[PDB]
Design a protein around this ligand. Structure first.
Ligand SMILES: Cc1cc2nc3c(=O)[nH]c(=O)nc-3n(C[C@H](O)[C@H](O)[C@H](O)COP(=O)(O)OP(=O)(O)OC[C@H]3O[C@@H](n4cnc5c(N)ncnc54)[C@H](O)[C@@H]3O)c2cc1C
Length: 449
């Protein structure tokens, strides 16, 4: 029950009513530090614990592909919490109004939320603390090491973040205690009206055939566990050598579950650590899910402008500024990028995989973002194009990994300077020819036509 995982957002008079767990980022019942800590206060105050989820008005900025995935998991989560005698209340509207009224109407004793370094979450918090007088607590249930404890400042590179995080692993990498059970309407109806409001925004092909294919990733806490088990048994050993090959589905495919909190990253690392495998494959995977995933939270926590040109490293800002007026080979607008109407078939295939499956391969994701910088009027124009496309079509989008990853590809955050080139300056450059020497670009293109 390590107290380093919890910050105090605002102190106040401890109410005599139930502890309310405001669930935003970690939509699961198993392996949830925020859920288990909320139960701890409930036992200490002789009072039950309840869970509240807010359905905000920002869902219309994304597609149905993310709406049903989240809502389907919440339907499963509702059953799980009822098995432990924990009621779950689902509210519609924005949290600033909804959380304040629910606390007043229920006389909540303590308010607990999970941690997210995103700008929108801080916006919701700022409205909440100005509407309640009960204590407000928040718990990092997303990172193995708490984000404010891994580092106290912005980390310039992964090689400076790795020694700090690994030094704290023996303390924070621990098992999850069991969620002991306890001593504003239906979920299906909200789904019904949600798609009806989103249906005009459906991504469609020429013949009005829906582009999205929902059979690639089943949502829910249960489906996440099988994916983790399938990756360890079947794909973990080849991960070290085939993670850069989009033609092979050797990735873990855990990101849609990780983003929604349907599976805990600590559970993944615990299971991978005791599994016996090729030694590189374990280290390569551990680097992504521990170093790179949790440095993405660090990037968003300590940079208020994580989605802006201002948060780029000084060398990258100077190089891109010096190459701002360089004539670009081609310029594409947002619609051409969206529908895949560029001269690059490799980029077009990556966009089609994104539009069809909702999860573009990690290696082609780097190629996809860097070509936006090459084919945009300004680095700022490419930054918003990349963010707009990523948050709209990726199942794992609107995530700290997304903004950190875009910043890495476009602004070279958590990277070093490379050879000076036109337009892109010293930013790491990936070429169509270089991709051909790494993997078979042909079979990747045919698969997504
Ligand atoms: C431009 C760009 C945008 C991205 N947008 C997102 C996004 O919106 N959401 C998202 O979850 N990831 C994003 N990624 C990070 C990475 O692409 C995905 O985490 C990864 O592709 C997810 O597929 P996987 O789980 O099967 O890969 P795996 O090889 O299995 O990786 C395992 C886990 O490690 C983490 N991870 C892996 N690679 C990275 C990385 N480069 N940075 C941070 N964490 C990583 C992920 O949590 C991942 O689930 C982005 C990467 C780039 C370059």
């Amino acid at each position: 029950m390590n107290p380093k995982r919890i910050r105090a957002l605002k102190s106040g008079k401890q109410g005599d009513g139930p502890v309310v767990y405001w669930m935003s980022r970690d939509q699961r019942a198993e392996d949830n530090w925020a859920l288990l800590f909320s139960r701890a206060i409930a036992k200490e105050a002789n009072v039950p614990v309840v869970v509240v989820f807010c359905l905000t008005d920002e869902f219309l900025e994304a597609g149905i592909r993310q709406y049903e995935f989240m809502l389907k998991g919440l339907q499963e989560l509702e059953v799980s919490l009822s098995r432990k005698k924990i009621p779950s209340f689902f509210l519609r509207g924005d949290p600033g109004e909804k959380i304040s009224r629910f606390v007043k109407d229920y006389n909540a004793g303590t308010l607990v939320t999970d941690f997210s370094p995103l700008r929108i979450k801080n916006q919701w918090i700022e409205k909440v603390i100005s509407g309640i007088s009960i204590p407000f607590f928040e718990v990092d249930a997303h990172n193995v090491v708490p984000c404010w404890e891994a580092s106290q400042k912005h980390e310039y590179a992964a090689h400076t973040f790795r020694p700090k995080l690994y030094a704290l692993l023996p303390e924070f990498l621990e098992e999850f205690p069991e969620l002991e059970p306890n001593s504003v309407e239906t979920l299906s109806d909200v789904l019904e009206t949600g798609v009806k409001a989103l249906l005009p925004e459906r991504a469609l092909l020429k013949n009005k055939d829906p582009l999205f294919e929902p059979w690639h990733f089943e949502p829910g806490e249960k489906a996440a566990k099988k994916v983790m088990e399938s990756f360890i048994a079947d794909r973990l050993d080849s991960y070290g050598a085939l993670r850069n090959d989009p033609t092979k589905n050797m990735l873990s495919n855990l990101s849609p579950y990780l983003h929604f909190g349907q599976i805990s990253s600590q559970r993944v690392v615990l299971e991978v650590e005791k599994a016996e495998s090729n030694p590189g494959s374990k280290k390569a995977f551990l680097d992504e899910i521990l170093i790179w995933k949790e440095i993405s939270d660090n990037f968003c926590y300590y940079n208020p402008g994580y989605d802006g040109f201002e948060s780029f490293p000084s060398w990258a800002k100077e190089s891109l500024n010096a190459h701002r007026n360089d004539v670009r080979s081609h310029i594409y607008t947002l619609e051409e990028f969206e529908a895949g109407k560029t001269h690059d078939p490799l980029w077009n295939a990556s966009q089609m995989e994104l539009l069809s499956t909702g999860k573009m391969h990690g290696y082609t994701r780097m190629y996809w973002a860097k070509k936006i910088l090459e084919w945009s009027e300004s680095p700022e124009k490419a930054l918003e194009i990349a963010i707009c496309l990523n948050d709209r079509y990726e199942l794992d989008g609107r995530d700290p990994n997304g903004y950190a990853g875009i910043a890495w590809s476009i602004g070279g955050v958590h990277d070093r300077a490379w050879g000076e080139r036109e337009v892109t300056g010293k930013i790491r450059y990936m070429s169509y020819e270089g991709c051909k020497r790494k993997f078979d670009v042909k079979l990747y293109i045919e698969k997504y036509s």
